[PDB]
Amino acid sequence: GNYAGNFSGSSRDICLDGARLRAECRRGDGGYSTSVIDLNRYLSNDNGHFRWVSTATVTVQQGDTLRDIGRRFDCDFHEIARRNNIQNEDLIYPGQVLQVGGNFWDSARDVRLVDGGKVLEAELRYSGGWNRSRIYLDEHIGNRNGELIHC
Ligand SMILES: CC(=O)N[C@@H]1[C@@H](O)[C@H](O[C@@H]2O[C@H](CO)[C@@H](O[C@@H]3O[C@H](CO)[C@@H](O[C@@H]4O[C@H](CO)[C@@H](O)[C@H](O)[C@H]4NC(C)=O)[C@H](O)[C@H]3NC(C)=O)[C@H](O)[C@H]2NC(C)=O)[C@@H](CO)O[C@H]1O
């Protein structure tokens, strides 16, 4: 079915201010706002590929594996491991607090909007070089009463 975001139908002059997405957004009342959303909070660089992963923490439960958590959050468990300085990817412990999500900007270059502001593209660092990647921002960026929000 539809994307959940669809900000682009109700927004114009879509711009990037570094990792921050800015637009003139329509408000319920016929007026306009200028709103910004920090895309570095919502997009990860998943070994060379844009992935929607919200900056968050996850507490390990008994029986979890890094693969399962990888699957639950859609991301390379190898990077979860490095980012959280995990000595052995097969050893995690209940109550362990793992940082996940965001942070694409730190390993991106040539970042720009294409397709009338609907698509973000970048060269993203991977284990072996730089990969060109694009992501449809309407998937998860929405306009609620003139504010850009993740949904
Ligand atoms: C990348 C990936 O996903 N790899 C998978 C492997 O992880 C998985 O093997 C299983 O992995 C889990 C999670 O690490 C593991 O469970 C952990 O096991 C250790 C014991 O070795 C427990 O350690 C103890 O914890 C308690 C407190 O919580 C301490 O008091 C105690 O001292 C610790 N013991 C030691 C020796 O230090 C962890 O608590 C426990 N963690 C969780 C989250 O339950 C399983 O034992 C692994 N299972 C097997 C069969 O090896 C592998 C197979 O499932 O699959 C890979 O894909």
mmCIF file of N, CA and C and ligand atoms in Angstrom, residues 60-69 77-78 88-96, ligand 1:
data_model
loop_
_atom_site.group_PDB
_atom_site.id
_atom_site.type_symbol
_atom_site.label_atom_id
_atom_site.label_comp_id
_atom_site.label_asym_id
_atom_site.label_seq_id
_atom_site.Cartn_x
_atom_site.Cartn_y
_atom_site.Cartn_z
ATOM 1 N N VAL A 60 19.146 -5.685 25.440
ATOM 2 C CA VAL A 60 19.202 -7.106 25.115
ATOM 3 C C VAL A 60 18.377 -7.937 26.109
ATOM 4 N N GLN A 61 17.590 -8.862 25.574
ATOM 5 C CA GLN A 61 16.872 -9.812 26.415
ATOM 6 C C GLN A 61 17.515 -11.182 26.293
ATOM 7 N N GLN A 62 17.387 -12.012 27.335
ATOM 8 C CA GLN A 62 17.869 -13.407 27.306
ATOM 9 C C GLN A 62 17.355 -14.163 26.088
ATOM 10 N N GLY A 63 18.265 -14.875 25.428
ATOM 11 C CA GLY A 63 17.962 -15.585 24.191
ATOM 12 C C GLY A 63 18.126 -14.817 22.888
ATOM 13 N N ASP A 64 18.199 -13.479 22.961
ATOM 14 C CA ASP A 64 18.479 -12.636 21.781
ATOM 15 C C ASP A 64 19.827 -13.006 21.158
ATOM 16 N N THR A 65 19.935 -12.763 19.848
ATOM 17 C CA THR A 65 21.207 -12.782 19.159
ATOM 18 C C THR A 65 21.320 -11.481 18.384
ATOM 19 N N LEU A 66 22.537 -11.136 18.014
ATOM 20 C CA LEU A 66 22.779 -9.904 17.268
ATOM 21 C C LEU A 66 22.083 -9.990 15.914
ATOM 22 N N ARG A 67 22.090 -11.169 15.294
ATOM 23 C CA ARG A 67 21.283 -11.368 14.077
ATOM 24 C C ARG A 67 19.810 -11.026 14.242
ATOM 25 N N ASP A 68 19.180 -11.521 15.311
ATOM 26 C CA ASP A 68 17.766 -11.265 15.561
ATOM 27 C C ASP A 68 17.513 -9.780 15.708
ATOM 28 N N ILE A 69 18.358 -9.121 16.495
ATOM 29 C CA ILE A 69 18.238 -7.686 16.688
ATOM 30 C C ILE A 69 18.472 -6.967 15.347
ATOM 31 N N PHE A 77 24.299 -6.210 11.547
ATOM 32 C CA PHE A 77 24.682 -6.455 12.944
ATOM 33 C C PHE A 77 26.193 -6.308 13.167
ATOM 34 N N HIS A 78 26.961 -6.346 12.079
ATOM 35 C CA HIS A 78 28.394 -6.092 12.173
ATOM 36 C C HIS A 78 28.673 -4.664 12.631
ATOM 37 N N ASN A 88 32.970 -9.893 20.699
ATOM 38 C CA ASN A 88 32.668 -11.142 20.015
ATOM 39 C C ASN A 88 31.195 -11.086 19.615
ATOM 40 N N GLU A 89 30.921 -11.069 18.309
ATOM 41 C CA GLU A 89 29.553 -10.878 17.806
ATOM 42 C C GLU A 89 28.552 -11.966 18.241
ATOM 43 N N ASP A 90 29.069 -13.111 18.689
ATOM 44 C CA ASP A 90 28.238 -14.224 19.172
ATOM 45 C C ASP A 90 27.943 -14.142 20.681
ATOM 46 N N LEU A 91 28.495 -13.126 21.352
ATOM 47 C CA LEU A 91 28.316 -12.937 22.802
ATOM 48 C C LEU A 91 27.695 -11.568 23.151
ATOM 49 N N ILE A 92 26.400 -11.599 23.463
ATOM 50 C CA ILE A 92 25.690 -10.473 24.047
ATOM 51 C C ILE A 92 24.960 -10.941 25.309
ATOM 52 N N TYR A 93 24.568 -9.997 26.162
ATOM 53 C CA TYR A 93 24.146 -10.356 27.512
ATOM 54 C C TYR A 93 22.862 -9.620 27.892
ATOM 55 N N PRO A 94 21.932 -10.292 28.606
ATOM 56 C CA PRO A 94 20.699 -9.599 28.973
ATOM 57 C C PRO A 94 20.964 -8.302 29.740
ATOM 58 N N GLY A 95 20.182 -7.276 29.467
ATOM 59 C CA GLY A 95 20.380 -5.994 30.116
ATOM 60 C C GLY A 95 21.391 -5.118 29.407
ATOM 61 N N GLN A 96 22.160 -5.666 28.455
ATOM 62 C CA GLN A 96 23.079 -4.876 27.599
ATOM 63 C C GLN A 96 22.338 -3.802 26.778
HETATM 64 C C1 LIG B 1 25.883 -12.954 15.147
HETATM 65 C C2 LIG B 1 24.916 -13.910 15.734
HETATM 66 O O1 LIG B 1 23.772 -13.662 15.784
HETATM 67 N N1 LIG B 1 25.400 -15.035 16.178
HETATM 68 C C3 LIG B 1 24.568 -16.084 16.696
HETATM 69 C C4 LIG B 1 25.041 -16.540 18.066
HETATM 70 O O2 LIG B 1 24.891 -15.479 18.969
HETATM 71 C C5 LIG B 1 24.209 -17.718 18.531
HETATM 72 O O3 LIG B 1 24.750 -18.317 19.660
HETATM 73 C C6 LIG B 1 24.086 -17.913 20.851
HETATM 74 O O4 LIG B 1 24.292 -16.561 21.216
HETATM 75 C C7 LIG B 1 23.663 -16.153 22.423
HETATM 76 C C8 LIG B 1 23.857 -14.676 22.643
HETATM 77 O O5 LIG B 1 25.208 -14.336 22.836
HETATM 78 C C9 LIG B 1 24.199 -16.946 23.609
HETATM 79 O O6 LIG B 1 23.628 -16.523 24.834
HETATM 80 C C10 LIG B 1 24.510 -15.904 25.757
HETATM 81 O O7 LIG B 1 25.347 -16.880 26.299
HETATM 82 C C11 LIG B 1 26.196 -16.525 27.350
HETATM 83 C C12 LIG B 1 26.933 -17.756 27.778
HETATM 84 O O8 LIG B 1 27.919 -18.128 26.839
HETATM 85 C C13 LIG B 1 25.506 -15.892 28.538
HETATM 86 O O9 LIG B 1 26.562 -15.417 29.358
HETATM 87 C C14 LIG B 1 26.300 -15.397 30.747
HETATM 88 O O10 LIG B 1 25.462 -14.361 31.149
HETATM 89 C C15 LIG B 1 25.147 -14.313 32.510
HETATM 90 C C16 LIG B 1 24.329 -13.080 32.827
HETATM 91 O O11 LIG B 1 23.404 -12.807 31.838
HETATM 92 C C17 LIG B 1 26.384 -14.295 33.389
HETATM 93 O O12 LIG B 1 26.073 -14.279 34.756
HETATM 94 C C18 LIG B 1 27.295 -15.443 33.034
HETATM 95 O O13 LIG B 1 28.471 -15.312 33.743
HETATM 96 C C19 LIG B 1 27.602 -15.419 31.560
HETATM 97 N N2 LIG B 1 28.412 -16.553 31.232
HETATM 98 C C20 LIG B 1 29.632 -16.484 30.817
HETATM 99 C C21 LIG B 1 30.258 -17.746 30.379
HETATM 100 O O14 LIG B 1 30.223 -15.484 30.780
HETATM 101 C C22 LIG B 1 24.554 -14.803 28.032
HETATM 102 O O15 LIG B 1 23.731 -14.282 29.055
HETATM 103 C C23 LIG B 1 23.692 -15.245 26.866
HETATM 104 N N3 LIG B 1 22.941 -14.122 26.376
HETATM 105 C C24 LIG B 1 21.659 -14.140 26.061
HETATM 106 C C25 LIG B 1 21.261 -12.917 25.287
HETATM 107 O O16 LIG B 1 20.882 -15.009 26.340
HETATM 108 C C26 LIG B 1 23.891 -18.413 23.363
HETATM 109 O O17 LIG B 1 24.468 -19.199 24.362
HETATM 110 C C27 LIG B 1 24.406 -18.877 22.010
HETATM 111 N N4 LIG B 1 23.863 -20.171 21.758
HETATM 112 C C28 LIG B 1 24.622 -21.151 21.363
HETATM 113 C C29 LIG B 1 23.911 -22.430 21.112
HETATM 114 O O18 LIG B 1 25.805 -21.047 21.212
HETATM 115 C C30 LIG B 1 24.308 -18.812 17.474
HETATM 116 C C31 LIG B 1 23.492 -20.019 17.851
HETATM 117 O O19 LIG B 1 22.227 -19.583 18.280
HETATM 118 O O20 LIG B 1 23.749 -18.298 16.309
HETATM 119 C C32 LIG B 1 24.503 -17.274 15.736
HETATM 120 O O21 LIG B 1 23.775 -16.923 14.575
#
